[PDB]
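Can't attach files on this board, so I'm pasting raw text. These are the components:
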Amino acid sequence: LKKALFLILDQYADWEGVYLASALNQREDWSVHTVSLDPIVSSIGGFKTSVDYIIGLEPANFNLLVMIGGDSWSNDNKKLLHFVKTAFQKNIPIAAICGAVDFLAKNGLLNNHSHTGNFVYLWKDYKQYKPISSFVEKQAVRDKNLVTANGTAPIEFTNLILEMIDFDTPENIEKMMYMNRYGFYHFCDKYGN
Amino acid sequence: LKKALFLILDQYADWEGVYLASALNQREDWSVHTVSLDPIVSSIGGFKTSVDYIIGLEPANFNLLVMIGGDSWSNDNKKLLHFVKTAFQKNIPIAAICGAVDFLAKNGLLNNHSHTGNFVYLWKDYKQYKPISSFVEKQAVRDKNLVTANGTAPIEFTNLILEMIDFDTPENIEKMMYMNRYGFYHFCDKYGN
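---
Top answer:
Structure tokens for the assembled complex are below.
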């Protein structure tokens, strides 16, 4: 059994991690749990999520850290930083999207990986954003155990993550993503199934 | 101020209502709230949602009823039926997707509207599925104040709903949906913005 922790903060983007969460949690070998600084966080959409783990109470080791976006990432919280930074040290697969990446950039966590994000100009004055690898202008990017993406790439984000964690064969993940993006009828066209 | 109630049951589809919920809730004139039979329901993805209203405790009148899919719609719950059926009587805009539509079909709520769903063969023995309007094989369908869709059409589902409720001009909703489906870079292509 493998564990995926979804780090969500208040006012988190509803649409960003839904494809990854369902794909993973439905597996017998994968478990999805949420972690936050608060026991209850609201999505931008108005949903209230009852968080599984409060930072400092989550399992020491898990297999995937998914940092979803939202409007609360300008956080100086030392507990939060330790939590994420520790995940990097343990070298566990990490995927960040939208606001989450702004957090990574500001705390010098993007300095050794190729990446992308919402808008690089927002980081121009981040004293800790000194990348060796330049910012890539694409929906999502993967470099070793780090996948980044802008808030408009839930599907691209999910695709690269499933690849990174060897979720399934490429000619299987491709189908799942096609179904997600184009729908049953277009899928039925290109696959019949 | 207008209210949208999202009816979610246990093991609900994470990906189906995220675009509609965020689009609506961000508006000053719209509020999104969840309603269920239980105070806490899990999404297929592993998220636990703290429901706003338990059926029987939700506001008597609201502006939109969104019934999201999942694996718990084979429900004989009389409270649930009364709740939905009452919404139909008050003629409030209603949108159903995935499993939710199976519920509509079985309780004779699709007999006077054109519609679609996951698979019509599943309703072949429903004694209450006697439509005047035939089942349409498309991602999503709108007929007056009823929008239906299969589980693979979150975006189509959202598009028709925003249209039904006159959320904005078509040449505005079209852009929002393009952004949702194709991403920033493809959007920037076709609009520059």
